[PDB]
Enzyme design. Sequence first.
Site, PDB file in Angstrom:
ATOM      1  N   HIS A   1      12.623 -11.530  -1.739  1.00  0.00           N
ATOM      2  CA  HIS A   1      12.759 -11.715  -3.101  1.00  0.00           C
ATOM      3  C   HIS A   1      14.159 -12.496  -3.457  1.00  0.00           C
ATOM      4  O   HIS A   1      14.811 -12.869  -4.603  1.00  0.00           O
ATOM      5  CB  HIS A   1      12.733 -10.789  -4.156  1.00  0.00           C
TER       6      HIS A   1
ATOM      7  N   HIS B   1      17.604   0.491  -1.305  1.00  0.00           N
ATOM      8  CA  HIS B   1      17.328  -1.122  -1.113  1.00  0.00           C
ATOM      9  C   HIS B   1      18.014  -1.874  -0.438  1.00  0.00           C
ATOM     10  O   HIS B   1      19.289  -2.271  -0.516  1.00  0.00           O
ATOM     11  CB  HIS B   1      17.256  -1.449  -2.618  1.00  0.00           C
TER      12      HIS B   1
ATOM     13  N   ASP C   1      21.097  -0.279  -4.351  1.00  0.00           N
ATOM     14  CA  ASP C   1      21.268  -1.099  -3.143  1.00  0.00           C
ATOM     15  C   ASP C   1      22.166  -0.494  -2.321  1.00  0.00           C
ATOM     16  O   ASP C   1      23.165  -0.109  -2.454  1.00  0.00           O
ATOM     17  CB  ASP C   1      21.615  -2.355  -3.889  1.00  0.00           C
TER      18      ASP C   1
ATOM     19  N   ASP D   1      12.370  -4.729  -6.934  1.00  0.00           N
ATOM     20  CA  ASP D   1      13.154  -5.596  -7.285  1.00  0.00           C
ATOM     21  C   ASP D   1      12.628  -7.107  -7.526  1.00  0.00           C
ATOM     22  O   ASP D   1      13.273  -7.953  -7.974  1.00  0.00           O
ATOM     23  CB  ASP D   1      14.626  -5.747  -6.156  1.00  0.00           C
TER      24      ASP D   1
ATOM     25  N   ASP E   1      18.376  -5.712   1.266  1.00  0.00           N
ATOM     26  CA  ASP E   1      17.706  -7.067   0.990  1.00  0.00           C
ATOM     27  C   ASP E   1      18.235  -7.565   2.443  1.00  0.00           C
ATOM     28  O   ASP E   1      19.157  -7.749   2.851  1.00  0.00           O
ATOM     29  CB  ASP E   1      18.807  -7.710  -0.039  1.00  0.00           C
TER      30      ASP E   1
HETATM   31  C1  LIG Z   1      20.275  -7.084  -9.378  1.00  0.00           C
HETATM   32  S1  LIG Z   1      19.967  -8.568  -8.775  1.00  0.00           S
HETATM   33  C2  LIG Z   1      19.079  -8.420  -7.139  1.00  0.00           C
HETATM   34  C3  LIG Z   1      19.906  -7.159  -6.381  1.00  0.00           C
HETATM   35  N1  LIG Z   1      19.101  -5.787  -6.753  1.00  0.00           N
HETATM   36  C4  LIG Z   1      19.692  -7.234  -4.998  1.00  0.00           C
HETATM   37  O1  LIG Z   1      18.751  -6.261  -4.285  1.00  0.00           O
HETATM   38  C5  LIG Z   1      19.058  -8.771  -4.699  1.00  0.00           C
HETATM   39  O2  LIG Z   1      17.800  -8.829  -4.449  1.00  0.00           O
HETATM   40  C6  LIG Z   1      19.356  -9.697  -6.261  1.00  0.00           C
HETATM   41  O3  LIG Z   1      18.545 -10.958  -6.331  1.00  0.00           O
HETATM   42 ZN   LIG Z   2      16.721  -7.085  -4.010  1.00  0.00          ZN
END
Ligand SMILES: CS[C@@H]1[C@@H](N)[C@@H](O)[C@@H](O)[C@H]1O
Ligand SMILES: [Zn+2]
EC number: 3.2.1.114
Length: 1014
Positions: free
Chosen positions: A441, A60, A311, A174, A62
């Site tokens: 997100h 994952h 992550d 997520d 971000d």
């Molecule tokens: C577990 S909190 C979440 C985390 N999994 C990270 O990927 C980010 O998006 C956050 O807001």
């Molecule tokens: Zn995330």
Amino acid sequence: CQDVVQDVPNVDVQMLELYDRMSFKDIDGGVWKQGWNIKYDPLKYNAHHKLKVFVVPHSHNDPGWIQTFEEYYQHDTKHILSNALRHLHDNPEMKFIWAEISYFARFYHDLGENKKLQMKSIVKNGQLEFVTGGWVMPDEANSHWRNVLLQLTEGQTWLKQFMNVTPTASWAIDPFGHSPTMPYILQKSGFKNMLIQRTHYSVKKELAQQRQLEFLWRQIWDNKGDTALFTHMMPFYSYDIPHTCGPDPKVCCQFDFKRMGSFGLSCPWKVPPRTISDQNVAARSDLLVDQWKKKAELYRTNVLLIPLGDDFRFKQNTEWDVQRVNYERLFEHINSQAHFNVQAQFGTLQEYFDAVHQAERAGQAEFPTLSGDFFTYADRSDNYWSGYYTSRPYHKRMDRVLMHYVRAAEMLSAWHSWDGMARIEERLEQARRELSLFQHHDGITGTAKTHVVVDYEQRMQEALKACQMVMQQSVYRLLTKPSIYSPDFSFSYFTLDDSRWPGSGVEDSRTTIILGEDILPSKHVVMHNTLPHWREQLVDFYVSSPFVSVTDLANNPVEAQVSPVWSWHHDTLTKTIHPQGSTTKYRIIFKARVPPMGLATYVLTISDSKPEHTSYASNLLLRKNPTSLPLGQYPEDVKFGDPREISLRVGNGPTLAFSEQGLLKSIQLTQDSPHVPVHFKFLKYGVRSHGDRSGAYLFLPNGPASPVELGQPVVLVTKGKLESSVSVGLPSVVHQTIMRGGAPEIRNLVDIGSLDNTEIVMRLETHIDSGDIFYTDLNGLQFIKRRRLDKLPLQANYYPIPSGMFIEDANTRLTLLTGQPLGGSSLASGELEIMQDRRLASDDERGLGQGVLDNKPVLHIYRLVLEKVNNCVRPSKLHPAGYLTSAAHKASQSLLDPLDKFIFAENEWIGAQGQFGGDHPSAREDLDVSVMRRLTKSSAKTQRVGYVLHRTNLMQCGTPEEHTQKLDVCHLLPNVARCERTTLTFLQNLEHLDGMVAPEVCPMETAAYVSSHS
Ligand SMILES: CS[C@@H]1[C@@H](N)[C@@H](O)[C@@H](O)[C@H]1O
Ligand SMILES: [Zn+2]
Ligand SMILES: *[C@@H]1O[C@H](CO)[C@@H](O)[C@H](O)[C@H]1NC(C)=O
């Protein structure tokens, strides 16, 4: 067309009904804390019916969170992708899925041709598989459906061009709660399957018990089921390894081989993983297969999905090896031991779904149907994630401003093919990508670290500048005699003027049109209307004299109203919030009339005295101990008075009554009707002193909100022929109610300042007998019925308000439309409330590692619509949806897609034209051209233009309304050679259209069309 109002769909699981019945008790279920001790019959699987297990490696990533997109790419993602290419290239059996195309595109363009070819080869051969393929994995609560489609299209168009693939399976592990707007968009974009993860732990338990975690998710109003999309909901608390192999994280953690030490990760359940060897492989396999068979009990087929990732995983080369090799030893032993009756292997997401559907087809399982949403999410106890419906509200409003600017820039420039030197494509790609990136997100959600929010803001700022450039170059070309048109693609022919962003008191960014007998007597202005119907809207400009009149390009006078430029200041000397009037500039207001998807030119001319067709507003300052307020050259003198109740009526419109505190008290629809009680009130929520604290994600109030102490506020009343308003300076908010003849507009300049641990809410109190029912929208697309539940805590009754909300009883409805997504609820019959901003000094323990103390002034906008609905044809009591009236939908369009305003920048515009688009069809009011986008560059012999058409569904309340034109988007441009219906991303042709005519769509449906021109 399917009737979306009168036929209640029959589904196996309807989430509002499920919520009504469920208890939501939070009991300790044993090792599966939020579940129960799962039991299975060892004889269920045998030689003739084996359990097929797909272990799906994933990482994952971000696109901004604790670090910015570029920082994570440099420190982590470029390494994860580089080592995925090496390891998959070298180990043919290994698999990996990838979701975030922003990162992949960033990586791939930096590869040398040899590595590009190796990458294309591992994608073509099935080892690397893209899931969803959007630029990001978007938030599903605050995002507008138009931007969810924009980002999906951005990543999928990149994928088709460079990797020659289009994902048909979606992976959303997520986002904090899930919306049915996703299957709506995916199913119309070629998808066949989707996966979700963050749903209420009580919902996971309820659905697991009935084996309803896999379902055909259809829209709430879909009676037939044509919108249905197969959906897989993961069963456990997280998507990490400890919560993906089975119900016991103490056992699953032992199968995350990155947790033995050298990587700085460990198991919190105190038992670490151990390298798989011939001496321990039997015992380890016994343990793992047991978890898998327990997880398999929650589902209907003999095909089991086991995600393997977390992550920013699969970074180190040693990490790829430790996971791959230990799992291959476990597979070789398990697959060879007949008594397990298991066949396990690495797989992809598509491989899992394909196997599930082969089992369905063999008649081995049938799946339940389901409609509804999965908000509001709670991951444990009373920790409901409703805080991020409001966090960082300045950027949530910016999202909607850029949403509209991108639409306007793409539409304005779509009309013509542009020379490469105009850099139109370049600027539009940048604008689309920065807006797409903000749908992440942790972007629009307001859950990133301070310096990351700064990065998203700077990117969006550049995106707005890019849109402005394209829009203004397009207006000049659309309204200048062709034989005179002589562009310098770097010059600014027009500057955009925007009344509501960043907004007065947020940033003084608006230019004043400077006129004068000894300098420039007049100025051309132009309005654009992105909507496909003729539209009138009052528009305003700042001018250097109050003596200004307006004409159209036939030199026909246009009625105008001039008012002062008022600004509010916190007087640190007097300790009052009061207005100051400009002595160097003024506001002119007039009604612009603009063709569908077109332009209209007007002229502002100065004179020495009051012009015949311009009126002046009167102004009244209500406060004890007043002081003079001179207005430079403004004609009429300001009046003063002690605070008192006041009433206003503009035109034939409603009559609004206000308290001596400057807040709305009642609304009288017609001169003889009753004064319906409608009271605005501002309150505040605090934070818990002991126990869990609110943070960027979580809203954990310390009880019902308390009234903001208002003191004796300063109230300003401006009464005009065309527009009037009452503005009041309250602590943390300059609240303004504007009247232009119909539903009022509300504007709040919200500055929470240094009030730590405070959430400011705006509430509406009415006597509407709504009971426990209210309605909120999902992604600006649909309205869903909500039922307030006293068995859940206050924060659980908060829902996203991405664009609007309402309450009603048999006769009356009050609808609040928003120009930004915020959180809100109806916590008692007759009430509506929506959070304005929140400032939190603590972290809420989800990993962000900071509170929210970066608040800045933001101007929130709204429309308040009170209406009688006893004559409307509404859905029955059992229907899960609600629908807006014509007035409420237009009110929403006025906030989200207002007319755009352009001021000619030089002294003289030679070759100016008065209008563009007068011959465009004026389509029925419920229809919109959501997107108009030229899809080809100028060297293409066959030009292609794409359109996304959306029709909403409006309540039928007895208004005849029947004079409109059929809109055929394929004939908007000349020389059409073909018209095709396509997926919403424009990437696949679905129907060759007869006559090169694009039909209109049904209520609640969205279609896409691409016209080709030779
Ligand atoms: C577990 S909190 C979440 C985390 N999994 C990270 O990927 C980010 O998006 C956050 O807001
Ligand atoms: Zn995330
Ligand atoms: C792209 O994918 C399709 C489907 O496999 C294939 O037939 C085609 O040859 C590939 N390459 C091209 C021409 O884009």
